[PDB]
Design a protein around this ligand. Structure first.
Ligand SMILES: Cc1cc2nc3c(=O)[nH]c(=O)nc-3n(C[C@H](O)[C@H](O)[C@H](O)COP(=O)(O)OP(=O)(O)OC[C@H]3O[C@@H](n4cnc5c(N)ncnc54)[C@H](O)[C@@H]3O)c2cc1C
Ligand SMILES: Cc1cc2nc3c(=O)[nH]c(=O)nc-3n(C[C@H](O)[C@H](O)[C@H](O)COP(=O)(O)OP(=O)(O)OC[C@H]3O[C@@H](n4cnc5c(N)ncnc54)[C@H](O)[C@@H]3O)c2cc1C
Ligand SMILES: C[C@H](/N=C/c1ccc(OCc2cccc(F)c2)cc1)C(N)=O
Ligand SMILES: C[C@H](/N=C/c1ccc(OCc2cccc(F)c2)cc1)C(N)=O
Lengths: 499, 494
């Protein structure tokens, strides 16, 4: 019943917040809706797979908070396989390559591709990580979808097609669904295009040995009976001296402060007394999560490696159910597997099928892309459609439709009396990721410590030392990448000389 | 505890559903979150105003269901004042006019304006009212915002400015916030551009004597203790023989079927067992309501009439807090008043001010537009910001951002086991309006009657006889309106 802080939600963000507060000597309770902790992370264990992440999985350089937390809990990472060649499959043919981006040989198409990535980062530099609505052209960019921006920016279909896949893969949403301002912010706050798309030296470099679910599980172990499972919060009352938090199973909790560590829109599942301020009231109806099915197909051996393919496939085209894959084989070389994402409208479309029907479609796609009949002989299959989850709303994260970020963005992490806001959506570095979950949970916890007079104001936001185990190489560009003209730039140069 | 049907929500839609079921002999209970019925309608009574609609108010020709229901409950209508001239205020000057559309004199601008309205209706003819996602170009139009469409269609700033006002006023949202497919559907399902924008012979022709709140209030009177106030629904369990509905104040209700008569997104406030199907689970996070403050300024006399102005003002420009007004004077000629809407981003922006600060800004605007110092001497003021309402989410209605209607639209009124869906958002004629609320509530009720084997399938959807009191004149066009070229059409001809 009585405690110092109630944390609503036992995902990584809520668990990180609770741990910090507990370590500081406060009495905390975590109220979790599900019969498990972890939220958008979920590690399944059985004999066929040993373990598999069906939710969040990848970590990499510059994600120092999640790496530090996991290390303290006794966890280790291993490198995702990128020894052999990557594949770009376009117009029904596969093209192997090395390096983070598929090579482009046509001079005009090359200029267009180069200008696309460059411009994404150029625009990003004008967007403050902690206040995207303060960008000089915030309103102009927010009033445009990513589809509109790509239509303007890409002078070739080749570039527009890859750019579209990039958006779909980053934020599990269609280009016409999302604000240009918000998407440009999203990429910039991860460190830019190269960092976000890279396996080696990027966001997909590593996974945790034994699964990411261990982060939330091991924190639960530390907290003991303080974590309450199957306690969905239904009601928060701030009209009295202590905050009252009610659960669906009829329990009452009393606290000095509350941390909301759930996806912003899931705040709708709670009835508030007094009512929320107008801006938050409407904000939480304007912020959907994306759509994705994560699918893992198991094989006897990692047969792709024999053909000098690492297992990474970038697959363009409406017909392909999966647009992106990575090798999901265990570090020991066993439980050979390919992980693939079914993205955005395809998650909606293909959800109609049976599990067996999806497995068949994936194997037939992989056989084509890898040019290997071996892909037609799976030994096992696991999948999770995150669109069906009442207490997630989708995956990976929340997207902002046109017009919303400028109008409502500033209230995302603004306290409401004694309620403070965590969750990855409120992070300023790797928001949308496990990293952002840690940043946000610890920041919200320190906001409360400051409110209690236990720490100074300058200690609310804290820097993180770089991991010694996962060093970060800097993002570099070549002279030609920096200075080569865009397509319209070249046309202007021609028009000028021919005058 | 035990009944035949639980109706969640006591707005016009829930009340209409409950009345139909009650009249058929079934035991109904209405669970309403607030301490009042009416929802997005709310009639305030006090000595200064007598009565005033702070929510939904206007009814007109072709809205036969709301007119019939109100008449049965003993209500009457009166005509909104449109005797004298309307005003279009643009670039700081007022231009009085007659007829539904402000006149345009520049020849190129005339062609652009004419083409805009015509094209809106042209596109609408290809959109089925009961299935907008079946339009031949559904995906193309759904993947575009109204801003993108207006940028393509309007060759003059004059037309684009008026078109933008039109969108803001219709759906209390910015042009860049909404799907083109959804907006074109919205206009078409009200009967087209002329019908939706007109006072005389259109959606704003009339108001109810005594206020629209009386519709929900008088149905509550009929139902007696069957309406439960301050019972927000928190939990619906369909895992057992009878459906279980739990409220925030700890009560349990047991029923054969449930009608959800709340805005689609407000379904998020209910925890479901078993969980909702995937498509509905995500749909209810993708469908926000618009933003509006409704403001009524009172004066000693309807002084604008002396200058041959009816009180209608169409006001363009960022600086103006209010883009549209109507005369809100009582039919008896007393309680003189001007009703105005603060729309979309302006509702967000000006909410920061005090009530007194908004009153001053409105009076100064009205003095400018009406060219009358009398506008600076208000006797009273009432306002309501619908953005603050936990159990509405906004007003007037739900809008669809780009991409949503095609992907999720088909599940809007699809039953989930024993839950059926009412609410104006599920209507096929005047969805967004009180009329749509009645259509949807009665249809959802008849879906349950059919499920119980009490009526045949062909009786679920029922036509409505035309009101004898509010006859509808047909929408007409002239030869020149039909056949004059667009701006690019004229350029092609040259
Ligand atoms: C398929 C998939 C792929 C992705 N891959 C990666 C990846 O590779 N790398 C990466 O870093 N991130 C990835 N992500 C995203 C990552 O998982 C999230 O960013 C992160 O887990 C979010 O943590 P959170 O604590 O902020 O929120 P959540 O994990 O959503 O936690 C919120 C918790 O609150 C609970 N809750 C909800 N409502 C209530 C209520 N009313 N009362 C009580 N409790 C409630 C929920 O049950 C949940 O446990 C992926 C996610 C998925 C699903
Ligand atoms: C300022 C304004 C101007 C508009 N003007 C007009 C106009 O001129 N003409 C016109 O026709 N229409 C107008 N509209 C729109 C019109 O009011 C609506 O279309 C109509 O009232 C909707 O009725 P409804 O029953 O479908 O939904 P609602 O009126 O929203 O009713 C839903 C009810 O459900 C309740 N509820 C919500 N959640 C729960 C819960 N969890 N448990 C139990 N109950 C719950 C709510 O409290 C509410 O009473 C306007 C509205 C406003 C606010
Ligand atoms: C699962 C999620 N990953 C996001 C992600 C985002 C972008 C990615 O880009 C891959 C890529 C490579 C080459 C070209 C291209 F367009 C995209 C790959 C993954 C995460 N790590 O949380
Ligand atoms: C309040 C809401 N009314 C919607 C409405 C919609 C459109 C309207 O258009 C007025 C108008 C007139 C002339 C030109 C123009 F662009 C708009 C007026 C009102 C309703 N009746 O529910």
């Amino acid at each position: 019943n009585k405690c110092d802080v109630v944390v609503v939600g036992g995902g990584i963000s809520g668990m990180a917040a609770a741990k910090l507060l507990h370590d500081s000597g406060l009495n905390v309770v975590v109220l979790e809706a599900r019969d498990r902790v972890g939220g958008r992370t979920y590690t399944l264990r059985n004999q066929k797979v040993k373990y598999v992440d069906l939710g969040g999985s990848y970590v990499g350089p510059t994600q120092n908070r999640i790496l530090r937390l996991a290390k303290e809990l006794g966890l280790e990472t291993y490198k995702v396989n990128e020894v052999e060649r990557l594949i770009h499959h376009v117009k029904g043919k596969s093209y192997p390559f090395r390096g983070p981006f598929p090579p482009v040989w046509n001079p005009i198409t090359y200029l267009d591709h180069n200008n696309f990535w460059r411009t994404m980062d150029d625009m990003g530099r004008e967007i403050p990580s902690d206040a995207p609505w303060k960008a000089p052209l915030a309103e102009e960019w927010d009033n445009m979808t990513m589809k509109e921006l790509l239509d303007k920016l890409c002078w070739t279909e080749s570039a527009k097609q890859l750019a579209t896949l990039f958006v779909n893969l980053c934020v599990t949403a269609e280009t016409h669904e999302v604000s240009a301002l918000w998407f440009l912010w999203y990429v910039k706050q991860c460190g830019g295009t190269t960092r976000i798309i890279s396996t080696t030296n990027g966001g997909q470099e590593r996974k945790f040995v034994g699964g990411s679910g261990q982060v939330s599980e091991r924190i639960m172990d530390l907290l003991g009976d303080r974590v309450k499972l199957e306690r969905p919060v239904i009601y928060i009352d701030q009209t009295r001296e202590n905050v009252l938090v009610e659960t669906l199973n009829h329990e009452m909790y009393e606290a000095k402060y509350v941390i909301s560590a759930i996806p912003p829109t899931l705040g709708m599942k709670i009835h508030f007394n007094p009512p929320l301020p107008m801006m938050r009231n409407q904000m939480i109806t304007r912020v959907p999560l994306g759509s994705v099915i994560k699918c893992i197909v198991y094989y006897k051996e990692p047969f792709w490696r024999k053909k000098d393919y690492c297992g990474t496939m970038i697959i363009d085209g409406e017909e392909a159910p999966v647009a992106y894959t990575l090798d999901d084989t265990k570090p020991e070389g066993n439980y050979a597997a390919i992980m693939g994402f079914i993205l955005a409208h395809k998650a909606r479309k293909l959800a109609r099928l049976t599990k067996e029907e999806r497995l068949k479609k994936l194997c037939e796609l992989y056989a084509k892309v890898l040019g290997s009949l071996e892909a037609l002989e799976p030994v096992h299959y696991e999948e999770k459609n995150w669109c069906e989850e009442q207490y997630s709303g989708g995956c990976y994260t929340t997207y902002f439709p046109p017009g919303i970020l400028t109008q409502y963005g500033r209230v995302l992490r603004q306290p409401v009396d004694r309620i403070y806001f965590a969750g990855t959506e409120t992070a300023t570095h790797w928001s949308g990721y496990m990293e952002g979950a840690v940043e946000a949970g610890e920041r919200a916890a320190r906001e409360i410590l400051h409110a209690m007079g236990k720490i100074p104001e300058d200690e609310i936001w804290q820097s993180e030392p770089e991991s010694v185990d996962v060093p970060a190489q800097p993002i570099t560009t070549t002279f030609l990448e920096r200075h080569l003209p865009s397509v319209p730039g070249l046309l202007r140069l021609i028009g000028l000389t021919t005058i």
